[PDB]
Curated annotation (Swiss-Prot), chain A:
<dbReference type="GO" id="GO:0016020">
    <property type="term" value="C:membrane"/>
</dbReference>
<keyword id="KW-1133">Transmembrane helix</keyword>
<keyword id="KW-1169">Fusion of virus membrane with host cell membrane</keyword>
<keyword id="KW-0946">Virion</keyword>
<protein>
    <recommendedName>
        <fullName>Entry-fusion complex protein OPG094</fullName>
    </recommendedName>
</protein>
<keyword id="KW-1160">Virus entry into host cell</keyword>
<dbReference type="GO" id="GO:0019031">
    <property type="term" value="C:viral envelope"/>
</dbReference>
<feature type="topological domain" description="Virion surface">
    <location>
        <begin position="1"/>
        <end position="67"/>
    </location>
</feature>
<keyword id="KW-0261">Viral envelope protein</keyword>
Curated annotation (Swiss-Prot), chain B:
<keyword id="KW-0261">Viral envelope protein</keyword>
<keyword id="KW-1162">Viral penetration into host cytoplasm</keyword>
<keyword id="KW-1160">Virus entry into host cell</keyword>
<comment type="subunit">
    <text>Interacts with OPG099/L5. Component of the entry fusion complex (EFC) composed of OPG053/F9, OPG076/O3, OPG086/G3, OPG094/G9, OPG095/L1, OPG099/L5, OPG107/H2, OPG143/A16, OPG104/J5, OPG147/A21 and OPG155/A28. Except for OPG095/L1 and OPG053/F9, each of the EFC proteins is required for assembly or stability of the complex.</text>
</comment>
<keyword id="KW-1133">Transmembrane helix</keyword>
<dbReference type="GO" id="GO:0019064">
    <property type="term" value="P:fusion of virus membrane with host plasma membrane"/>
</dbReference>
<keyword id="KW-0812">Transmembrane</keyword>
<feature type="topological domain" description="Virion surface">
    <location>
        <begin position="1"/>
        <end position="64"/>
    </location>
</feature>
<keyword id="KW-1168">Fusion of virus membrane with host membrane</keyword>
Length: 67, 64
């Protein structure tokens, strides 16, 4: 079994300046993305970083793994 | 050796600091961890640890 397979719906979103992760398996609410030093990511320009599948569609982990 | 992936991505090196980086990563299925090489430093992510997952996923999801 691959523990990454239940993460395949994960996608990023910006809630104002907070970078969030949607689509996680066991989670009721979206949770914050963390920096490499384990802090919640807060970024005024959050929306300019988000990647898309050539439409407003957000990139999911499934999309990344199948590239 | 375990095969690697190479990604061009953006990494939040602090809560509000982002930097472009190329990383090499691999998945060790015996221990359930992803190991990442970033500018000569090794980072380990336990895929059973939700805190580690919340750190790994933005790195993968901002990748080209």
């Amino acid at each position: 079994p691959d523990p990454i397979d239940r993460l395949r719906r994960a996608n990023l979103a910006c809630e104002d300046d907070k970078l969030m992760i949607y689509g996680l398996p066991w989670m009721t609410t979206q949770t914050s993305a963390l920096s490499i030093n384990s802090k919640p990511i807060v970024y005024k320009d959050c929306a300019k970083l988000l990647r898309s599948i050539n439409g407003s569609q957000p990139v999911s982990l499934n999309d990344v793994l199948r590239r | 050796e375990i095969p690697t992936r190479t990604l061009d991505t953006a990494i939040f090196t602090d809560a509000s600091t982002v930097a472009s980086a190329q990383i090499h990563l691999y998945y060790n299925s015996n221990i359930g961890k992803i190991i990442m090489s970033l500018n000569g430093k090794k980072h380990t992510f336990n895929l059973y640890d939700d805190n580690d997952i919340r750190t790994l996923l933005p790195i993968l999801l901002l990748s080209k």
